[PDB]
Structure formats: structure tokens, C-alpha cells
Amino acid sequence: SPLMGGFGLKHPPPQILIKNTPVPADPPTTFNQSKLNSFITQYSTGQVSVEIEWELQKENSKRWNPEIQYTSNYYKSTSVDFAVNTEGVYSEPRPIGTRYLTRNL
Amino acid sequence: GADGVGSSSGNWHCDSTWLGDRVITTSTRTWALPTYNNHLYKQISNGTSGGATNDNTYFGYSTPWGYFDFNRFHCHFSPRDWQRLINNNWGFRPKRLSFKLFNIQVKEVTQNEGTKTIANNLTSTIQVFTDSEYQLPYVLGSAHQGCLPPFPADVFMIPQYGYLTLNNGSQAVGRSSFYCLEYFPSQMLRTGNNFQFTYTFEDVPFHSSYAHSQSLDRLMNPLIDQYLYYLSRTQTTGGTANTQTLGFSQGGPNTMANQAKNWLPGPCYRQQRVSTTTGQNNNSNFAWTAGTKYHLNGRNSLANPGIAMATHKDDEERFFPSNGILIFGKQNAARDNADYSDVMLTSEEEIKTTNPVATEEYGIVADNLQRGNQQNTARQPQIGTVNSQGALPGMVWQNRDVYLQGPIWAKIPHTDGNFHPSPLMGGFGLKHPPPQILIKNTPVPADPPTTFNQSKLNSFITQYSTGQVSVEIEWELQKENSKRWNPEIQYTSNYYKSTSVDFAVNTEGVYSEPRPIGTRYLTRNL
Amino acid sequence: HSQSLDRLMNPLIDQYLYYLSRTQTTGGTANTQTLGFSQGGPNTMANQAKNWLPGPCYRQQRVSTTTGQNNNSNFAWTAGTKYHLNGRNSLANPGIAMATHKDDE
């Protein structure tokens, strides 16, 4: 199991490699064996969508008292947590783990 | 489907698939094609008036077309694939090929003042055709630059097609032919079209991807004597006055040079010996005056590399025939007068077993008729040295080795006869080789005048084309079935540490091949 | 044939193979041994690497139709091109197929 946390996979999601095909500038009119090192400056744009399906494991607990949950602070503040500020910069104010519900050993 | 400006007409396919006795190499590159000769055919020639010697005269034509050349082995095999081939197989040969030309992009260049603009010309075409009937002069098989690069990430420029015909000095004769390539059916492609064709190699013998573990003069049993006799003595011994006699012996283990044998080494065309230690060579410029040449129509041509002969004998790796080996250049070597450290000499020492050494004679023959002093004056047997020797019955020989950087095939000239038509530079001699693919940018005229003029248009739009080219060859393998006990010799990388990886790019992105790699590593019995 | 055997090349492109073009330095007053290699191109086509060789040879004696150019002796048989069989000399007539003369001769 990875030491940074997560799912250790023998065959993980394969890495997707992407590149702009080179487009040469005008070559000389006399033949030259050297490889072409003059190209047209270029870049690409587009959209990428990734969809993951996760499987859940629901809790079946007989604990009587209420659990600990992750919650937003009710108090007033200058900005909303996990939202953009006045300059349009999105930020995450804190790290959020996943261990809130409880179990017996 | 639906071909247009916005859809791709091919996919990048560079790979190799080993399956049984087959290996299928596919390769894709990116090319650029300029406009050659200003869309003109031009008569080219070279005479002795300029200052050239009669050996270098020619008459021919320079065409505006370009051609595709994948006639080297590194166009199809990676260095690791070449290692899988030569370490495990006794022979190989090509079976069929596929060729594709896709993702065409024709671009136009404008040059107002000192500004250069490159824009798409969506309606321009390129023309492509293959010489499937072998009706044009075949210029593949002359070891010319302009191949598909060995490194798949390199972009290459397509070479210009030209040809030669008969000449008398710088002039032509009545039999000199002129060919217009526009006089052929050609396919026109806009940015949404692609081109493709397939080809099947004829039956050609496998390349000998092995060395011999026996030599021709050592096929005997080293324990048993022969029942045949040989003349071992013509003069008595021991006494003070020796007289003539006849004495015969049986060839055995201790006299194996005298034994009767069934075969002879291959033919010879002796070369001059040059040492890589310069201090050992003669102090004169003898590369051409002492070269090994052939004579054709009063024109001397170097026999380069010539017939397949062993480069050197045992313990003499520093010697090579003056023009009897293939010599490749290291990455970024000069075109003229490159130093010895800038080139990579090949070596055919693996065929010492059947082929004579290139710098040695073939053998010894008699010159006169020996006689005694019975009547006329006594005459001692005279011998002569055989420096050239054509085919004799009972000869056996090997061809020249193929290399990763070397050529693959050549076209066998259409003649009345030939002897062992295997190309002297190494490879597969084909009566009908892969046809040459010709390519050109269709001319696009600039604005013509508004009043009619009969003159042909000589003002065009500056243009060039780009695209991808994929070639896939299927090779047939000949697996080794050996009962040798000890391990073979294999090609291997050096384990030691180094500044760069061999057959990889350096810090500047330049790919290079550090050495030539032959194919004779496994062994066989004669 | 409209081509010759030593002219099957492309007259515009250089060869990638090298040939030994120099065995002695030049320029100086005392020239020493060296090794120099060049690529065969359009201007040096006699040095280019080639795949084939001309046919076999069995050299004959040259006779001119201008009698004044020939030697003043009766050499039709003494200088003939012959083969030897069982101690009998036979003229090799006409012999193997060879070009009668070169250009302009």
C-alpha cells in the first residue's frame, strides 16, 4: 500500500502521453541531409473529461451517541471556505481526511 | 469515410512485432518537401573542359521531383531490434512491404520586405506515383543520403530525383534518353487525401547471419590418415650427391596442407593493404594511383568495395583493403577529408574461412615446364602469383555482411547474363526491387498578365509540403538449430559506466550511432 | 542500354559511405603519412561505392582500319588471341562478347 496514502495497483491507470506534431518551416531548395531544426511555433488547446466510478462501503453501526462529522464553521467570515476570493483565486483552506465515522476493533 | 481539412488521414505507427519465424517492422517519420529546380527539368553534365578528369564525366537531367528512400536497415530496425535479430537467427530476408503517405499539409510562403509569413494553402496538391514498371532510371541502391532517419523523432528533407544517361565527355549521344516524370499517371493529393501501396518481394536467398566455425582447409578428420597419396619428394636425401627420385606419402594429421581436398576458396580481386597505424604506410598519396579499379569505356572506376573478401588475416586487425570495405561516418563528420577518428571502418574477417584475404594473393600456379639436364640446359620450376582469380569449379564463398547503417537491396541490372547477382555493397539483389516513390508539389502560378502571352509561366507561388510517411516491412527469419556446447558470441552493450548511452541522444538532442553492427555472431559448420 | 554501369547513381545527392581519399598530408614542406576519408558525390563518381562489375575479359590485339597506324609486321597469327587444347592452338574467334572499341575510336 503506497506510503503516501492511496491504492497500490499492479496495473494502474496508464499514463496518457500527448504532443504537438512538429511542423517544419520552409526547407531549403537544395537537398541537405541534416535533420530539420526550423519549425513553426505552435501550441494546442482542448478539453479533457475523466469519469471515475467508485464503490462505497456503507456503515452499519449500533452506536447510540452521535458521530463526529466534517462540517463548515457557522460563524461569519470574510470569504467562504473552498470558494473564490475577490480576485477570482480559488483556494482550499485546510486538508480534509476521511476518518470521521467510527468502528470497533 | 469523410476526408477533409479538419480530419486526420493517418495515425502514427512505429513498432515491431516478433511472431514465430516472422518479424514485422513498421516505421513512421515526418518529412518536408521543397520545390526543386523552380519546377524545371535541367540538363546537367560534367566534362574535362571544366577541370574534371575523364573518369568523372557525366550527362544527365535534374528533375523537379523528390523520392522516398528507406533502403537502409536502421530505417526499420531499432538498435535493440537489430540485437534480437543478429543474436538469435541464422538468416533473414524481406517478404513484403506497405507504404503510406498521410496528413498532407501544403504551405505557402510570402516574403514582403524582411518579413516571412507561412500560411496554409488548403487547395494546393502534391503529386505521388510509384515506378511500378521500372521505366525510369533506378537511383536507389547507390547508397545515397536522404533516407528515413534512424531516430523516429527526427524530421527529414526529401531528396531531389535526378538521373544519368550515356555521355561522351560532357556531351550526349543519340542513345541518351530523356525522361519527363509528368509523362506518368500520378495521384494528386490535397490536405485531406492520403496515398498508399503494397509490394511483395520476390524469392531471394536468406542473408547469411552467421560465421563459420570451420575453415575450408580444415574439414578433415584430425586422427585418420588419407588413403590417397601425394608427391612428397623429387630428390633423394642423406647422401653427398643427391639425385632425382619420386617419393609419395599419405596426407595425415601432421601434413594437412598436402591433403587432397574437394573445394577451393572463393574468387579474388586483390586490393592494396593500408594500416590504421599511419607510420606503417608508405609516405605517398596512393589512394587513387594504387587503387583497385575496373575499366569501362575508357573510364576508370574504383572497385569499391568489390567482391566479398576477408578484410585481414589472423592478428592483423590494423590492416584493411584500400577500397575494399564499407566505411560509415560518425555523427557530424566532414564530407571531405575526414580524419580516421571520424569514420567507422567495417571488417569482414568472419569470412576468412571460405573467402581469401582481400590484400593477399589467391594462390600459386606454375609458369614454365621444369626439366633436367639430360639434353637441353636444366630448367628450374617457376611459379607465378595469382592476384586475380575468376570462378573455378569447386569454389565456395560467402557474401558481404549487412549492417544496421548499411543498404538493404539493389536492383539487378537488366542484362543477358550475370554471375552471382548479389550486390557488392551487401544486401539482397532483386530483379524487381521496391519501386521508387516519386513526389512533387504541383506548381501554383502567381497572377498571370491580363493580356495573353504564349510564353510558359515562370512566376509561381512559393510553397512546400509536410506530412507523415509510414513503411512496414515483413521479414522472414531462419532460426538456428545448433548442437554447439559452449556459449556463442553475442552482440552486447558495455556494462561499464559512461557519459552517454550508446544509440541514444546526447545533452543537445543529437542522436548518434557509435559503431557499425554486422549480423554474423552465431556460428555454423561448413 | 541507355545507361552505363558506372553511372547508375543519382547525380545530385552524395553518398553516405566514405572512401579513402588521402594517404599523405598536403600543403606543408615535408608531407607525412595520414588517413583521410571523403564521401562520393557528383564530382567524384569514379570513387563512389557501386554494386556491380563489368563482364569478363579476354584481351585482344587492336588493329586500325587506317593501315598506316598499324605495326609494320604480319602479326595476324603470331599476336592473335588463342586458346590451347591438347597441344593445339586455336584462335579465340570471335571470343567472348566484348565492346569493339570505346568512344571516338
Check CB contact of C37 with chain B, cutoff 8 Å.
Answer: yes
Secondary structure in 3-state letters for B401-420:
CCCCCCECEEECCCCCCCCC
Name the 3-class secondary structure at B56: helix
Comparing alpha-carbon positions, the chain C residue that sits nearest to A34 is C16
Helix H or strand E segment including A65: none
Residues of A with Cβ-Cβ distance to C16 under 8 angstroms? 33
Neighbouring subunits of A (3+ Cβ pairs under 8 A): B, C
With the C-alpha atoms ordered C74, C80, C84, C89, is the resulting torsion angle positive or negative? negative
Chain C CB contacts of B417 under 8 Å are: 55
Q: Phi first, then psi: what are they for B374, rounded to 5°?
A: -70, -55
CA dihedral B48, B52, B54, B55 (to 10 degrees): -160
Handedness of CA C31, C33, C34, C38 (dihedral sign): positive
Ordered alpha helix ranges (H), B142-213: none
> Is residue A46 marked as binding?
no
C37·B62 Cβ contact <8 A: no
SS3 state at C46: coil
Cβ of residue A29 closer than 8 Å to a chain C Cβ: no
B268-302 burial code (b ≥16 CB/10 A, e <16)? bbbbbbbeeebeebeeebbbbebbbbbebbebbbb
Nearest to C13 among B53, B145, B167 (CB): B145
Chain C interface test: which of A29, A30, A31 (most C C-beta within 10 Å): A31
Identify the residue among B167, B301, B419 best suited for mutation to test binding to C, counting C beta carbons within 10 A and taking the highest. B301
Give the closest-approach CA distance of B125 to chain A in angstroms. 16
* Residue appearing with cell numbers 511483395: B200
Which chain A residue is nearest to residue C12, measuring alpha carbons? Answer: A31
Cβ B197 vs Cβ B507: under 8 Å:
no
**Closest CA of chain C from B164, distance in Å:** 6
A1 is in an annotated binding site: yes
Buried b (16+ CB within 10 A) or exposed e, B347-373: ebbbbbbbbbbbbbebeeeeeeeeeee
**Residue contact B142–C15, C-beta within 8 A:** yes
**Grid cell in block for residue B360:** 593477399
Which residues pair with residue B46 across a beta bridge?
Answer: B58
Method for structure elucidation: cryo-EM
The DSSP secondary-structure symbol of B389 reads E
Give the bridge partners for B194, in sequence order.
Answer: none
How far apart, in whole angstroms, are the C-alpha atoms of residue B126 and residue B466? 10
Residues in chain B within 8 Å Cβ distance of A19: none
Name which of B322, B335, B413 is nearest C52 (Cβ-Cβ).
Answer: B413
Using CB atoms, which residue from B166, B282, B342 is nearest to C3? Answer: B166
Find the length of chain B: 526
CA distances from residue B139 to B161, B179, B182, B433, C8 in whole angstroms, order as listed: 8, 14, 18, 11, 6
Q: What are phi and psi of B74, to 5 degrees?
A: -75, -5
Residues B406, B82: Cα–Cα separation, whole Å: 12
Ranges assigned E (strand) in C4-95 = 18-24, 33-39, 82-85, 88-91
How far, CA to CA in Å, does B454 sit from each of B18, B40, B458, C48? 60, 18, 12, 44
Asked whether the CA dihedral B458, B460, B462, B468 is positive or negative, the reply is negative
What's the rounded Cα separation, in Å, for the pair B312 and B324?
Answer: 11
- What span, in angstroms and rounded, lies between the C-alpha atoms of C75 and A12? 92
Radius of gyration over alpha carbons of chain C, in Å?
Answer: 22
Q: Give B230's DSSP letter.
A: E
CA distance B209 to B404: 13
Q: Phi, psi (5° rounding) for residue B160?
A: -85, 135
d(CA C36, CA B334): 10
Decide if B356 contacts B310 (C-beta within 8 A).
yes
Residues 6+ apart with CB under 8 A from B499: none
DSSP bridge pairs for B327: B345, C18
Cα B479–chain centre separation: 24
Q: Could you tell me the sign of the dihedral formed by the alpha carbons of C98, C100, C104, C105, in that order?
A: positive
Distance from chain centroid for Cα B488: 27
Whether B51 has its CB under 8 Å from any CB of chain C: the answer is: no
Shortest CA distance from A26: residue in chain B: B464
Facing B287 at nearest CB: one of C22, C52, C99: C22
User: In angstroms, rounded to a whole number, what is the distance separating the alpha carbons of residues B469 and B101?
Assistant: 5
Task: Compute the nearest-CA separation of C75 from chain B (Å).
Answer: 24
Question: Residue B271 CA to chain centroid, in angstroms?
Answer: 19
* The pairing of beta strand B299-302 with beta strand B89-110: unpaired
Number of Cβ within 10 Å of residue B435's Cβ equals: 20
B466 touches chain A (CB under 8 A): yes
Cβ partners under 8 Å of residue B509, min gap 6? none
Rounded Cα gap, residues B424 and B406, in angstroms: 12
Contact C36 B338 (CB under 8 A): yes
Q: Does A33 touch chain C (CB under 8 A)?
A: yes
Asked whether the beta carbons of B342 and B334 are under 8 A apart, the reply is yes
| CA B85 – CA B480 distance, rounded (Å) | 11
Q: Is B22 helix (H, G, I), strand (E, B) or coil?
A: strand
Contacts of A27 in chain B (CB under 8 A): 32-34, 157, 464
- B446: which 3 cell numbers? 502567381
Measure Cα distances from B62 to A69, B284, C2 in Å: 83, 38, 17
Asked if A74 and A67 count as a contact pair (C-beta separation under 8 A), the reply is: no
CA dist B78 to A35, B74, B82, B84, B150, Å?
A: 18, 6, 6, 10, 8
**Is the CB of B30 less than 8 angstroms away from the CB of A22?**
yes
Q: Are B87 and B79 in contact (CB under 8 A)?
A: no
Q: Are B519 and B401 in contact (CB under 8 A)?
A: yes
The amino acid sitting at B394 is: G
Single-letter residue type at B336: D
C-alpha cell of residue B334: 566532414
Which of the residues A21, A34, A38, A40 would you substitute to probe the B interface, choosing the one with the greatest number of B C-beta atoms within 10 Å?
A21
Separation of alpha carbons A66 and B318, rounded Å: 90
The cell numbers describing C40, all together, are: 562520393
Interatomic CA distance for residues A25 and A40, integer angstroms: 5
Residue count (chain C):
105
Q: Do B145 and C15 touch (CB under 8 A)?
A: yes
Work out the minimum CA distance from B36 to partner chain A, whole angstroms. 6
Residue B295 CB contacts under 8 Å (≥ 6 apart), including other chains: B301, C54
Classify B352 as helix, strand or coil: coil
- Candidates B466, B468, B510, B512: best to mutate against A (most CBs of A within 10 A) is B466
Contact C16, B144 (CB under 8 A): yes
Q: Is the CB of residue A34 less than 8 Å away from at least one CB of chain C?
A: no
Which of B155, B161, B405 should be substituted to probe chain A, the one whose Cβ sees the most A Cβ atoms within 10 Å?
B155
Nearest CA in chain A to C15: A33
Chain A: residue whose CA lies nearest to C13:
A31
The answer to whether the Cβ–Cβ distance between B144 and C9 falls below 8 Å is yes
For Cα atoms C31, C33, C39, give the angle at the middle one, nearest 5 degrees: 105
Smallest CA–CA separation between C87 and chain B, in Å? 14
Instruction: Quickly count: other Cβ atoms within 10 Å of residue C2's Cβ.
Output: 13
**Contacting subunits of C (3+ beta carbon pairs below 8 A):** A, B
* Cβ neighbourhood burial of B516 (10 Å; 0-12, 13-18, 19+): middle
Q: Which helix (H) or strand (E) holds B79?
A: helix B79-88
